[PDB]
Design a protein around this ligand. Sequence first.
Ligand SMILES: [Mg+2]
Ligand SMILES: [Mg+2]
Lengths: 74, 166, 78, 113
Amino acid sequence: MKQGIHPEYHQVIFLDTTTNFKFLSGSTKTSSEMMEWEDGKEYPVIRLDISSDSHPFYTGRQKFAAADGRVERF
Amino acid sequence: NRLKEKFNTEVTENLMKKFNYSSVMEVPKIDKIVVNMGVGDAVQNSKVLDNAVEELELITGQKPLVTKAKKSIATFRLREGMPIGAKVTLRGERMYEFLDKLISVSLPRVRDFQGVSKKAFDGRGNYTLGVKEQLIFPEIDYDKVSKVRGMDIVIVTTANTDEEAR
Amino acid sequence: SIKKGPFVDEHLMKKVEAQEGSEKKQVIKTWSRRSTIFPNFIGHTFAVYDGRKHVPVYVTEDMVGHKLGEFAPTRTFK
Amino acid sequence: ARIAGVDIPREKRVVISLTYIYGIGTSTAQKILEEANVSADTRVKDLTDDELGRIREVVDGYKVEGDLRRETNLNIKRLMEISSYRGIRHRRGLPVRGQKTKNNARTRKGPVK
RNA sequence: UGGGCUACACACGUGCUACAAUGGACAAUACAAAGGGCAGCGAAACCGCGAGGUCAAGCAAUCCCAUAAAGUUGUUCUCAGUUCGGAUUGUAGUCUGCAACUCGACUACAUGAAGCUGGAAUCGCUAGUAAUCGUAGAUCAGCAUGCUACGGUGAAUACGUUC
Ligand SMILES: [Mg+2]
Ligand SMILES: [Mg+2]
Protein backbone atom coordinates (compact mmCIF):
# COMPACT_ATOMS: atom_id res chain seq x y z
CA MET A 1 0.00 0.00 0.00
CA LYS A 2 2.57 2.47 -1.23
CA GLN A 3 1.02 5.90 -1.71
CA GLY A 4 -0.40 7.57 -4.76
CA ILE A 5 -0.95 5.18 -7.62
CA HIS A 6 -3.84 3.12 -6.43
CA PRO A 7 -7.58 3.66 -6.76
CA GLU A 8 -9.27 3.84 -3.37
CA TYR A 9 -11.50 1.14 -1.95
CA HIS A 10 -13.38 0.85 1.33
CA GLN A 11 -16.20 -1.09 2.91
CA VAL A 12 -19.90 -1.14 2.04
CA ILE A 13 -23.14 -2.85 3.07
CA PHE A 14 -24.63 -5.19 0.46
CA LEU A 15 -28.40 -4.98 1.02
CA ASP A 16 -29.24 -8.61 0.29
CA THR A 17 -32.75 -9.98 0.78
CA THR A 18 -31.25 -12.48 3.30
CA THR A 19 -29.55 -10.70 6.24
CA ASN A 20 -27.24 -8.52 4.05
CA PHE A 21 -24.15 -10.47 5.14
CA LYS A 22 -21.49 -8.45 3.37
CA PHE A 23 -19.60 -5.56 4.94
CA LEU A 24 -16.40 -6.16 2.97
CA SER A 25 -14.62 -3.78 0.60
CA GLY A 26 -14.77 -2.80 -3.05
CA SER A 27 -14.15 -0.02 -5.56
CA THR A 28 -17.84 0.72 -6.22
CA LYS A 29 -19.30 4.06 -5.14
CA THR A 30 -22.78 5.60 -5.20
CA SER A 31 -25.16 7.31 -2.79
CA SER A 32 -25.16 5.94 0.77
CA GLU A 33 -28.81 5.02 1.16
CA MET A 34 -29.07 3.09 4.46
CA MET A 35 -26.06 3.24 6.75
CA GLU A 36 -25.59 0.91 9.71
CA TRP A 37 -23.26 0.69 12.68
CA GLU A 38 -23.05 -3.06 13.27
CA ASP A 39 -21.40 -3.25 9.83
CA GLY A 40 -19.11 -0.74 8.10
CA LYS A 41 -20.52 2.74 8.67
CA GLU A 42 -19.57 3.83 5.19
CA TYR A 43 -20.93 4.11 1.64
CA PRO A 44 -23.95 1.80 1.97
CA VAL A 45 -24.62 1.72 -1.76
CA ILE A 46 -23.79 -1.95 -2.41
CA ARG A 47 -27.14 -2.92 -3.80
CA LEU A 48 -28.02 -6.60 -3.79
CA ASP A 49 -26.59 -10.00 -4.58
CA ILE A 50 -27.95 -13.54 -4.90
CA SER A 51 -25.51 -14.91 -2.31
CA SER A 52 -27.38 -17.01 0.23
CA ASP A 53 -30.82 -17.71 -1.24
CA SER A 54 -30.33 -20.69 -3.57
CA HIS A 55 -26.89 -22.22 -3.88
CA PRO A 56 -26.72 -25.09 -6.37
CA PHE A 57 -25.68 -27.18 -3.34
CA TYR A 58 -26.79 -25.69 0.00
CA THR A 59 -30.48 -25.24 -0.91
CA GLY A 60 -33.25 -26.98 -2.80
CA ARG A 61 -34.18 -26.21 -6.40
CA GLN A 62 -37.22 -27.35 -8.36
CA LYS A 63 -37.67 -30.97 -9.39
CA PHE A 64 -36.52 -32.79 -12.52
CA ALA A 65 -38.59 -32.83 -15.68
CA ALA A 66 -39.72 -36.23 -16.97
CA ALA A 67 -38.71 -39.87 -17.32
CA ASP A 68 -40.43 -42.40 -19.58
CA GLY A 69 -43.17 -43.03 -17.01
CA ARG A 70 -46.51 -42.95 -18.85
CA VAL A 71 -48.50 -41.72 -15.88
CA GLU A 72 -51.11 -40.20 -18.20
CA ARG A 73 -52.71 -43.54 -19.21
CA PHE A 74 -51.30 -42.76 -22.66
CA ASN B 1 -12.86 -8.90 9.76
CA ARG B 2 -15.55 -11.38 10.74
CA LEU B 3 -14.04 -13.96 8.40
CA LYS B 4 -10.85 -13.85 10.44
CA GLU B 5 -12.56 -14.43 13.78
CA LYS B 6 -14.36 -17.41 12.28
CA PHE B 7 -10.88 -18.57 11.32
CA ASN B 8 -10.07 -17.97 15.00
CA THR B 9 -13.15 -19.53 16.56
CA GLU B 10 -14.66 -22.09 14.19
CA VAL B 11 -11.77 -23.85 12.42
CA THR B 12 -9.57 -23.92 15.54
CA GLU B 13 -11.38 -26.66 17.44
CA ASN B 14 -12.40 -28.45 14.24
CA LEU B 15 -9.14 -28.97 12.38
CA MET B 16 -7.20 -29.76 15.56
CA LYS B 17 -9.70 -32.44 16.65
CA LYS B 18 -10.52 -33.93 13.22
CA PHE B 19 -6.97 -34.07 11.86
CA ASN B 20 -5.80 -34.42 15.49
CA TYR B 21 -2.77 -32.14 15.59
CA SER B 22 -0.82 -31.75 18.81
CA SER B 23 -0.17 -28.04 19.27
CA VAL B 24 -2.59 -25.17 18.76
CA MET B 25 -0.75 -23.18 16.10
CA GLU B 26 -0.68 -25.96 13.54
CA VAL B 27 -3.79 -25.35 11.42
CA PRO B 28 -3.38 -24.56 7.71
CA LYS B 29 -3.12 -20.81 7.36
CA ILE B 30 -3.91 -19.18 4.03
CA ASP B 31 -0.91 -17.59 2.34
CA LYS B 32 -0.82 -15.41 -0.85
CA ILE B 33 -3.53 -15.29 -3.52
CA VAL B 34 -1.94 -14.80 -6.91
CA VAL B 35 -4.08 -13.65 -9.83
CA ASN B 36 -2.63 -14.05 -13.33
CA MET B 37 -4.48 -13.01 -16.49
CA GLY B 38 -2.81 -13.80 -19.78
CA VAL B 39 -3.52 -11.96 -23.02
CA GLY B 40 -3.67 -13.53 -26.46
CA ASP B 41 -2.37 -10.42 -28.18
CA ALA B 42 1.31 -9.52 -28.15
CA VAL B 43 0.47 -6.13 -29.67
CA GLN B 44 -2.12 -3.79 -28.20
CA ASN B 45 -5.03 -5.50 -26.42
CA SER B 46 -3.19 -5.54 -23.06
CA LYS B 47 -3.40 -1.74 -23.12
CA VAL B 48 -7.12 -2.10 -22.42
CA LEU B 49 -6.92 -5.04 -20.01
CA ASP B 50 -4.90 -3.22 -17.36
CA ASN B 51 -7.92 -1.49 -15.82
CA ALA B 52 -10.09 -4.61 -15.61
CA VAL B 53 -8.26 -6.33 -12.76
CA GLU B 54 -7.65 -3.04 -10.91
CA GLU B 55 -11.39 -2.67 -10.48
CA LEU B 56 -11.47 -6.05 -8.72
CA GLU B 57 -8.44 -5.52 -6.44
CA LEU B 58 -6.82 -2.06 -6.60
CA ILE B 59 -3.20 -3.26 -6.40
CA THR B 60 -1.54 -1.88 -9.53
CA GLY B 61 -0.54 -5.14 -11.12
CA GLN B 62 2.81 -5.92 -12.61
CA LYS B 63 3.18 -6.33 -16.34
CA PRO B 64 5.48 -9.37 -16.60
CA LEU B 65 7.75 -10.37 -19.44
CA VAL B 66 8.62 -13.56 -21.23
CA THR B 67 11.74 -15.53 -20.41
CA LYS B 68 12.69 -17.22 -23.66
CA ALA B 69 11.05 -15.37 -26.62
CA LYS B 70 9.66 -18.62 -27.97
CA LYS B 71 8.82 -19.93 -31.40
CA SER B 72 6.15 -18.30 -33.52
CA ILE B 73 4.59 -15.39 -31.67
CA ALA B 74 6.68 -13.00 -29.60
CA THR B 75 10.14 -11.57 -29.01
CA PHE B 76 11.79 -10.97 -25.66
CA ARG B 77 10.37 -8.74 -22.89
CA LEU B 78 6.83 -8.10 -24.04
CA ARG B 79 3.85 -8.09 -21.69
CA GLU B 80 1.46 -11.05 -21.47
CA GLY B 81 -0.11 -10.90 -18.05
CA MET B 82 -0.84 -9.17 -14.78
CA PRO B 83 0.08 -10.94 -11.52
CA ILE B 84 -1.16 -9.41 -8.27
CA GLY B 85 -0.28 -10.69 -4.84
CA ALA B 86 -3.04 -10.46 -2.26
CA LYS B 87 -1.80 -11.23 1.20
CA VAL B 88 -3.55 -10.17 4.41
CA THR B 89 -6.28 -7.55 4.35
CA LEU B 90 -7.02 -8.64 0.79
CA ARG B 91 -6.67 -12.42 1.23
CA GLY B 92 -9.17 -12.19 4.02
CA GLU B 93 -11.34 -10.15 1.65
CA ARG B 94 -11.04 -11.43 -1.92
CA MET B 95 -11.50 -14.97 -0.65
CA TYR B 96 -14.32 -13.42 1.37
CA GLU B 97 -15.77 -12.43 -1.99
CA PHE B 98 -17.86 -15.60 -2.16
CA LEU B 99 -19.87 -14.04 -5.01
CA ASP B 100 -18.90 -16.35 -7.80
CA LYS B 101 -22.66 -16.95 -7.63
CA LEU B 102 -23.11 -14.47 -10.49
CA ILE B 103 -21.59 -17.11 -12.81
CA SER B 104 -24.31 -19.46 -11.53
CA VAL B 105 -23.72 -22.34 -13.97
CA SER B 106 -22.97 -24.96 -11.28
CA LEU B 107 -20.66 -22.80 -9.09
CA PRO B 108 -19.04 -26.01 -7.78
CA ARG B 109 -15.55 -25.22 -8.91
CA VAL B 110 -13.42 -28.37 -8.92
CA ARG B 111 -12.84 -31.78 -7.38
CA ASP B 112 -9.17 -32.55 -8.07
CA PHE B 113 -7.01 -29.69 -6.79
CA GLN B 114 -3.34 -30.44 -7.72
CA GLY B 115 -0.83 -32.96 -6.44
CA VAL B 116 1.18 -30.62 -4.29
CA SER B 117 -0.78 -28.93 -1.55
CA LYS B 118 -2.02 -25.78 -3.28
CA LYS B 119 -5.37 -25.16 -4.91
CA ALA B 120 -5.82 -23.33 -8.20
CA PHE B 121 -9.06 -22.10 -9.76
CA ASP B 122 -10.56 -20.61 -12.89
CA GLY B 123 -13.09 -18.06 -14.05
CA ARG B 124 -14.72 -17.02 -17.30
CA GLY B 125 -15.49 -13.38 -17.97
CA ASN B 126 -17.29 -10.58 -16.15
CA TYR B 127 -19.13 -12.91 -13.75
CA THR B 128 -17.31 -12.69 -10.45
CA LEU B 129 -16.02 -9.62 -8.58
CA GLY B 130 -19.37 -7.89 -8.30
CA VAL B 131 -17.95 -4.36 -8.17
CA LYS B 132 -17.47 -4.24 -11.95
CA GLU B 133 -20.17 -3.27 -14.47
CA GLN B 134 -21.28 -5.09 -17.61
CA LEU B 135 -21.36 -2.02 -19.86
CA ILE B 136 -17.89 -0.81 -20.82
CA PHE B 137 -16.37 -4.29 -21.26
CA PRO B 138 -16.83 -5.85 -24.73
CA GLU B 139 -14.15 -8.51 -24.13
CA ILE B 140 -13.87 -11.70 -22.08
CA ASP B 141 -11.91 -10.57 -19.03
CA TYR B 142 -11.34 -14.07 -17.67
CA ASP B 143 -8.92 -14.67 -14.80
CA LYS B 144 -7.01 -17.45 -13.03
CA VAL B 145 -6.90 -17.07 -9.25
CA SER B 146 -5.09 -19.40 -6.85
CA LYS B 147 -5.04 -20.30 -3.16
CA VAL B 148 -1.98 -21.72 -1.39
CA ARG B 149 -1.91 -22.91 2.21
CA GLY B 150 0.82 -23.75 4.67
CA MET B 151 -0.59 -27.28 4.81
CA ASP B 152 1.23 -30.19 3.25
CA ILE B 153 -1.74 -32.45 2.47
CA VAL B 154 -4.35 -32.05 -0.26
CA ILE B 155 -6.77 -33.61 2.21
CA VAL B 156 -6.13 -30.54 4.36
CA THR B 157 -6.97 -28.37 1.36
CA THR B 158 -10.23 -30.32 1.05
CA ALA B 159 -11.26 -29.31 4.55
CA ASN B 160 -9.91 -25.76 4.52
CA THR B 161 -12.14 -24.60 1.65
CA ASP B 162 -15.24 -25.51 3.66
CA GLU B 163 -16.82 -22.11 2.98
CA GLU B 164 -16.39 -21.78 -0.83
CA ALA B 165 -18.99 -24.11 -2.34
CA ARG B 166 -16.91 -27.33 -2.70
CA SER C 1 -50.54 -39.25 -31.97
CA ILE C 2 -53.86 -38.96 -30.11
CA LYS C 3 -55.46 -40.22 -26.89
CA LYS C 4 -57.10 -43.66 -26.56
CA GLY C 5 -54.72 -46.58 -26.67
CA PRO C 6 -51.38 -46.12 -28.51
CA PHE C 7 -52.11 -48.90 -31.05
CA VAL C 8 -49.97 -51.92 -30.45
CA ASP C 9 -50.87 -54.46 -33.11
CA GLU C 10 -52.93 -57.05 -31.30
CA HIS C 11 -51.28 -60.26 -32.50
CA LEU C 12 -47.95 -58.94 -31.20
CA MET C 13 -49.71 -58.46 -27.85
CA LYS C 14 -50.99 -62.04 -28.20
CA LYS C 15 -47.42 -63.22 -28.53
CA VAL C 16 -45.87 -61.20 -25.72
CA GLU C 17 -48.53 -61.29 -22.97
CA ALA C 18 -48.25 -65.08 -22.69
CA GLN C 19 -44.68 -65.30 -24.00
CA GLU C 20 -43.30 -63.82 -20.74
CA GLY C 21 -43.74 -66.94 -18.58
CA SER C 22 -40.48 -68.89 -18.42
CA GLU C 23 -36.79 -67.97 -18.87
CA LYS C 24 -36.71 -68.74 -22.61
CA LYS C 25 -35.60 -66.38 -25.41
CA GLN C 26 -37.37 -66.87 -28.77
CA VAL C 27 -38.13 -63.37 -29.73
CA ILE C 28 -40.53 -62.21 -32.42
CA LYS C 29 -40.53 -63.10 -36.12
CA THR C 30 -42.90 -60.18 -36.74
CA TRP C 31 -41.97 -57.74 -39.57
CA SER C 32 -44.74 -55.41 -38.40
CA ARG C 33 -43.00 -52.05 -38.05
CA ARG C 34 -46.06 -50.27 -36.65
CA SER C 35 -46.57 -50.94 -32.95
CA THR C 36 -45.38 -48.91 -29.98
CA ILE C 37 -43.79 -50.29 -26.82
CA PHE C 38 -46.09 -51.53 -24.11
CA PRO C 39 -44.21 -51.15 -20.80
CA ASN C 40 -44.52 -54.84 -19.91
CA PHE C 41 -41.79 -55.96 -22.28
CA ILE C 42 -39.28 -58.67 -21.41
CA GLY C 43 -35.71 -59.09 -22.65
CA HIS C 44 -36.08 -60.18 -26.27
CA THR C 45 -35.13 -59.14 -29.76
CA PHE C 46 -37.34 -58.51 -32.80
CA ALA C 47 -37.15 -58.89 -36.57
CA VAL C 48 -38.56 -55.58 -37.66
CA TYR C 49 -38.14 -55.36 -41.47
CA ASP C 50 -39.51 -57.48 -44.31
CA GLY C 51 -37.73 -56.72 -47.58
CA ARG C 52 -34.57 -58.51 -46.55
CA LYS C 53 -33.62 -58.20 -42.87
CA HIS C 54 -34.43 -59.64 -39.50
CA VAL C 55 -32.47 -57.10 -37.47
CA PRO C 56 -32.46 -58.30 -33.83
CA VAL C 57 -33.17 -55.05 -31.98
CA TYR C 58 -32.76 -54.60 -28.25
CA VAL C 59 -35.81 -54.10 -26.05
CA THR C 60 -33.56 -52.30 -23.53
CA GLU C 61 -35.01 -49.56 -21.35
CA ASP C 62 -34.96 -46.72 -23.86
CA MET C 63 -37.57 -43.99 -24.15
CA VAL C 64 -40.36 -46.56 -24.50
CA GLY C 65 -42.99 -43.98 -25.40
CA HIS C 66 -42.09 -43.89 -29.10
CA LYS C 67 -44.94 -45.03 -31.36
CA LEU C 68 -42.60 -46.99 -33.61
CA GLY C 69 -40.42 -50.03 -33.92
CA GLU C 70 -38.16 -47.68 -35.85
CA PHE C 71 -34.81 -48.79 -34.47
CA ALA C 72 -34.28 -50.68 -37.75
CA PRO C 73 -33.43 -48.41 -40.70
CA THR C 74 -34.18 -49.13 -44.33
CA ARG C 75 -31.32 -47.95 -46.58
CA THR C 76 -27.77 -46.57 -46.60
CA PHE C 77 -26.33 -43.19 -47.53
CA LYS C 78 -22.65 -43.86 -48.33
CA ALA D 1 -30.41 -6.01 -16.18
CA ARG D 2 -30.58 -8.61 -13.44
CA ILE D 3 -32.92 -11.38 -14.61
CA ALA D 4 -30.64 -14.05 -16.10
CA GLY D 5 -26.98 -13.16 -16.14
CA VAL D 6 -27.72 -9.67 -17.39
CA ASP D 7 -30.71 -8.34 -19.30
CA ILE D 8 -28.59 -6.05 -21.51
CA PRO D 9 -30.93 -3.60 -23.31
CA ARG D 10 -31.96 -0.30 -21.81
CA GLU D 11 -34.73 2.18 -22.78
CA LYS D 12 -36.76 -0.30 -24.88
CA ARG D 13 -40.15 -1.62 -23.93
CA VAL D 14 -39.83 -4.30 -21.27
CA VAL D 15 -42.25 -6.65 -23.06
CA ILE D 16 -39.56 -7.26 -25.68
CA SER D 17 -36.63 -6.49 -23.39
CA LEU D 18 -37.61 -9.75 -21.67
CA THR D 19 -37.06 -11.52 -24.99
CA TYR D 20 -33.26 -11.23 -24.85
CA ILE D 21 -33.31 -13.59 -21.89
CA TYR D 22 -33.53 -17.21 -22.89
CA GLY D 23 -36.71 -19.21 -22.65
CA ILE D 24 -39.12 -16.26 -22.57
CA GLY D 25 -40.11 -14.11 -25.50
CA THR D 26 -42.83 -12.02 -27.19
CA SER D 27 -45.82 -14.12 -26.19
CA THR D 28 -45.09 -15.52 -22.74
CA ALA D 29 -43.37 -12.22 -22.14
CA GLN D 30 -46.86 -10.75 -22.28
CA LYS D 31 -47.99 -13.46 -19.86
CA ILE D 32 -45.11 -13.25 -17.36
CA LEU D 33 -45.60 -9.49 -17.44
CA GLU D 34 -48.09 -10.10 -14.63
CA GLU D 35 -47.53 -7.74 -11.70
CA ALA D 36 -49.03 -4.53 -10.44
CA ASN D 37 -46.82 -1.47 -11.08
CA VAL D 38 -45.37 -3.39 -14.05
CA SER D 39 -46.38 -2.11 -17.48
CA ALA D 40 -44.41 -1.33 -20.64
CA ASP D 41 -44.25 2.45 -21.03
CA THR D 42 -40.74 2.97 -22.52
CA ARG D 43 -39.19 2.67 -19.05
CA VAL D 44 -36.87 -0.30 -19.35
CA LYS D 45 -33.98 0.99 -17.26
CA ASP D 46 -36.22 3.20 -15.15
CA LEU D 47 -39.32 3.20 -12.91
CA THR D 48 -38.21 0.16 -10.90
CA ASP D 49 -35.55 -0.61 -8.32
CA ASP D 50 -37.79 -2.67 -6.03
CA GLU D 51 -40.63 -3.40 -8.48
CA LEU D 52 -38.11 -5.52 -10.40
CA GLY D 53 -37.90 -7.81 -7.38
CA ARG D 54 -41.34 -9.29 -7.84
CA ILE D 55 -40.95 -9.92 -11.59
CA ARG D 56 -38.02 -12.24 -11.12
CA GLU D 57 -39.13 -13.79 -7.85
CA VAL D 58 -42.08 -15.01 -9.90
CA VAL D 59 -39.63 -16.08 -12.62
CA ASP D 60 -37.84 -18.17 -10.01
CA GLY D 61 -41.34 -19.42 -9.24
CA TYR D 62 -41.92 -19.82 -12.99
CA LYS D 63 -40.99 -23.48 -12.99
CA VAL D 64 -39.37 -23.71 -16.42
CA GLU D 65 -36.09 -22.17 -15.51
CA GLY D 66 -34.96 -20.08 -18.43
CA ASP D 67 -31.23 -20.71 -18.36
CA LEU D 68 -30.78 -23.31 -15.58
CA ARG D 69 -32.32 -26.05 -17.75
CA ARG D 70 -29.97 -25.71 -20.72
CA GLU D 71 -28.92 -29.26 -19.77
CA THR D 72 -32.32 -30.75 -20.52
CA ASN D 73 -32.42 -30.20 -24.29
CA LEU D 74 -29.19 -32.18 -24.60
CA ASN D 75 -30.56 -34.65 -22.06
CA ILE D 76 -33.53 -35.27 -24.36
CA LYS D 77 -31.53 -34.92 -27.57
CA ARG D 78 -28.54 -36.99 -26.46
CA LEU D 79 -31.04 -39.52 -25.15
CA MET D 80 -32.34 -39.70 -28.71
CA GLU D 81 -28.91 -40.85 -29.90
CA ILE D 82 -29.86 -44.32 -28.82
CA SER D 83 -30.36 -44.77 -32.61
CA SER D 84 -34.08 -44.71 -33.14
CA TYR D 85 -34.76 -41.82 -35.60
CA ARG D 86 -35.49 -38.05 -35.51
CA GLY D 87 -32.12 -36.96 -34.23
CA ILE D 88 -30.50 -40.38 -34.46
CA ARG D 89 -29.22 -40.34 -38.01
CA HIS D 90 -29.57 -36.65 -38.53
CA ARG D 91 -26.59 -36.36 -36.16
CA ARG D 92 -24.65 -39.63 -36.22
CA GLY D 93 -24.26 -39.21 -39.98
CA LEU D 94 -25.54 -35.60 -39.90
CA PRO D 95 -28.27 -35.09 -42.53
CA VAL D 96 -31.13 -32.67 -41.81
CA ARG D 97 -34.76 -33.10 -40.81
CA GLY D 98 -37.04 -31.55 -43.40
CA GLN D 99 -37.89 -34.70 -45.38
CA LYS D 100 -35.91 -33.71 -48.53
CA THR D 101 -32.21 -34.11 -47.86
CA LYS D 102 -30.81 -33.43 -51.34
CA ASN D 103 -33.18 -31.95 -53.83
CA ASN D 104 -33.43 -28.33 -52.73
CA ALA D 105 -31.20 -25.72 -51.14
CA ARG D 106 -30.86 -27.50 -47.82
CA THR D 107 -28.09 -25.34 -46.42
CA ARG D 108 -29.52 -24.48 -42.99
CA LYS D 109 -27.71 -27.55 -41.65
CA GLY D 110 -25.16 -27.96 -44.45
CA PRO D 111 -21.89 -26.05 -44.08
CA VAL D 112 -21.72 -24.38 -47.50
CA LYS D 113 -22.55 -25.06 -51.14
C1' U E 1 -47.47 -58.48 -46.23
C1' G E 2 -43.48 -55.30 -45.99
C1' G E 3 -39.60 -51.95 -48.10
C1' G E 4 -39.10 -48.22 -52.64
C1' C E 5 -40.82 -44.14 -56.09
C1' U E 6 -38.79 -38.78 -51.17
C1' A E 7 -32.53 -41.79 -50.54
C1' C E 8 -27.06 -37.83 -51.10
C1' A E 9 -20.55 -34.21 -51.45
C1' C E 10 -23.32 -32.37 -55.84
C1' A E 11 -25.16 -29.42 -61.39
C1' C E 12 -29.53 -26.66 -63.53
C1' G E 13 -34.79 -25.35 -64.34
C1' U E 14 -39.20 -23.42 -62.64
C1' G E 15 -42.14 -21.18 -58.13
C1' C E 16 -42.80 -18.97 -53.13
C1' U E 17 -41.36 -15.92 -48.54
C1' A E 18 -38.02 -12.16 -47.22
C1' C E 19 -33.88 -8.17 -46.49
C1' A E 20 -37.53 -3.20 -43.64
C1' A E 21 -39.89 3.02 -41.47
C1' U E 22 -44.87 5.03 -48.53
C1' G E 23 -42.27 -0.81 -42.85
C1' G E 24 -43.78 -4.02 -38.44
C1' A E 25 -47.08 -4.98 -33.88
C1' C E 26 -51.72 -3.74 -31.66
C1' A E 27 -56.75 -3.45 -30.72
C1' A E 28 -61.27 -1.05 -33.28
C1' U E 29 -63.11 -0.20 -38.34
C1' A E 30 -66.17 -0.57 -44.86
C1' C E 31 -66.97 -2.30 -50.11
C1' A E 32 -66.85 -8.08 -54.48
C1' A E 33 -67.08 -11.71 -58.22
C1' A E 34 -67.29 -16.69 -59.28
C1' G E 35 -68.29 -21.14 -57.09
C1' G E 36 -69.88 -25.96 -54.22
C1' G E 37 -73.07 -28.27 -50.56
C1' C E 38 -79.76 -34.18 -49.74
C1' A E 39 -75.20 -38.34 -44.88
C1' G E 40 -72.78 -33.57 -47.91
C1' C E 41 -72.48 -27.90 -46.32
C1' G E 42 -73.22 -26.50 -41.52
C1' A E 43 -75.16 -21.85 -38.74
C1' A E 44 -76.67 -19.66 -33.81
C1' A E 45 -75.55 -20.01 -28.74
C1' C E 46 -71.83 -23.43 -26.19
C1' C E 47 -66.38 -26.14 -23.76
C1' G E 48 -60.77 -24.97 -25.51
C1' C E 49 -53.94 -20.50 -25.89
C1' G E 50 -55.57 -22.17 -31.03
C1' A E 51 -55.42 -26.42 -34.08
C1' G E 52 -60.91 -27.77 -32.65
C1' G E 53 -64.98 -31.27 -29.43
C1' U E 54 -69.86 -32.10 -28.52
C1' C E 55 -74.64 -31.65 -29.56
C1' A E 56 -77.61 -28.86 -33.14
C1' A E 57 -82.41 -25.96 -36.53
C1' G E 58 -82.23 -24.60 -41.46
C1' C E 59 -81.17 -26.76 -47.09
C1' A E 60 -80.74 -25.02 -53.42
C1' A E 61 -80.93 -16.71 -55.96
C1' U E 62 -83.77 -17.69 -50.60
C1' C E 63 -80.04 -21.94 -46.24
C1' C E 64 -74.61 -23.00 -45.01
C1' C E 65 -69.26 -22.88 -45.67
C1' A E 66 -68.75 -17.20 -45.97
C1' U E 67 -65.15 -12.31 -41.61
C1' A E 68 -62.81 -11.32 -48.40
C1' A E 69 -58.11 -9.04 -48.17
C1' A E 70 -55.34 -4.70 -49.64
C1' G E 71 -57.01 0.71 -47.73
C1' U E 72 -59.15 4.49 -44.68
C1' U E 73 -59.05 6.96 -38.95
C1' G E 74 -56.11 6.07 -34.61
C1' U E 75 -52.03 4.01 -30.70
C1' U E 76 -47.00 2.40 -30.89
C1' C E 77 -41.93 0.63 -32.30
C1' U E 78 -37.80 5.51 -34.40
C1' C E 79 -33.57 3.30 -38.78
C1' A E 80 -31.10 -1.75 -35.42
C1' G E 81 -28.39 -8.93 -37.75
C1' U E 82 -32.70 -5.21 -34.99
C1' U E 83 -40.16 -5.61 -31.73
C1' C E 84 -36.85 -7.25 -39.94
C1' G E 85 -37.50 -12.65 -41.22
C1' G E 86 -39.11 -18.18 -39.39
C1' A E 87 -34.96 -21.18 -41.82
C1' U E 88 -33.76 -24.83 -38.06
C1' U E 89 -34.81 -27.95 -33.35
C1' G E 90 -37.09 -30.73 -28.62
C1' U E 91 -41.44 -31.05 -25.68
C1' A E 92 -47.08 -31.03 -25.23
C1' G E 93 -51.75 -31.69 -28.79
C1' U E 94 -55.77 -31.94 -32.89
C1' C E 95 -57.76 -34.34 -37.09
C1' U E 96 -58.30 -37.68 -41.04
C1' G E 97 -57.43 -43.10 -40.89
C1' C E 98 -57.13 -50.28 -39.40
C1' A E 99 -52.80 -47.34 -38.53
C1' A E 100 -48.73 -40.68 -39.41
C1' C E 101 -41.34 -44.50 -37.74
C1' U E 102 -39.61 -44.75 -43.20
C1' C E 103 -43.55 -40.72 -45.37
C1' G E 104 -48.51 -36.20 -44.18
C1' A E 105 -51.07 -31.32 -42.17
C1' C E 106 -52.25 -27.61 -38.61
C1' U E 107 -51.84 -25.17 -33.83
C1' A E 108 -49.01 -22.25 -29.16
C1' C E 109 -43.92 -22.98 -26.13
C1' A E 110 -39.08 -21.38 -26.36
C1' U E 111 -35.44 -21.91 -29.99
C1' G E 112 -34.63 -17.88 -33.60
C1' A E 113 -29.95 -19.28 -38.56
C1' A E 114 -29.13 -17.22 -44.05
C1' G E 115 -29.83 -12.41 -45.72
C1' C E 116 -28.44 -4.96 -46.59
C1' U E 117 -32.39 -4.88 -53.20
C1' G E 118 -27.62 -9.23 -55.47
C1' G E 119 -20.93 -10.69 -61.31
C1' A E 120 -20.91 -12.26 -66.43
C1' A E 121 -25.55 -12.80 -68.39
C1' U E 122 -30.92 -13.29 -68.93
C1' C E 123 -36.58 -12.95 -69.18
C1' G E 124 -42.32 -11.02 -68.95
C1' C E 125 -45.42 -7.19 -70.38
C1' U E 126 -48.68 -1.57 -74.79
C1' A E 127 -54.79 0.23 -70.31
C1' G E 128 -58.20 -2.61 -66.75
C1' U E 129 -52.60 -4.19 -69.19
C1' A E 130 -47.71 -5.90 -65.84
C1' A E 131 -47.26 -5.68 -60.97
C1' U E 132 -49.93 -6.04 -54.93
C1' C E 133 -52.73 -8.66 -51.22
C1' G E 134 -56.79 -11.94 -51.58
C1' U E 135 -61.62 -15.28 -53.29
C1' A E 136 -63.41 -20.06 -55.19
C1' G E 137 -62.78 -24.96 -57.71
C1' A E 138 -61.47 -29.92 -59.49
C1' U E 139 -58.37 -33.87 -57.98
C1' C E 140 -59.62 -35.78 -52.78
C1' A E 141 -61.09 -39.57 -45.99
C1' G E 142 -56.65 -36.79 -44.72
C1' C E 143 -52.97 -33.93 -46.80
C1' A E 144 -50.73 -28.12 -52.71
C1' U E 145 -46.25 -22.24 -52.78
C1' G E 146 -48.55 -26.10 -58.60
C1' C E 147 -53.04 -25.93 -61.52
C1' U E 148 -57.19 -23.86 -64.28
C1' A E 149 -60.90 -20.03 -63.11
C1' C E 150 -62.99 -14.70 -60.27
C1' G E 151 -63.01 -9.77 -58.48
C1' G E 152 -60.30 -5.28 -55.78
C1' U E 153 -56.54 -1.52 -56.10
C1' G E 154 -53.85 0.38 -60.92
C1' A E 155 -49.61 3.62 -63.08
C1' A E 156 -44.93 5.00 -66.48
C1' U E 157 -43.94 4.50 -71.72
C1' A E 158 -44.18 3.59 -77.97
C1' C E 159 -40.86 10.47 -82.04
C1' G E 160 -39.05 6.33 -84.66
C1' U E 161 -37.18 1.11 -88.48
C1' U E 162 -30.73 2.35 -88.31
C1' C E 163 -29.08 -2.04 -86.04
MG1 LIG F 1 -41.31 -38.82 -58.62
MG1 LIG G 1 -70.15 -15.87 -40.33
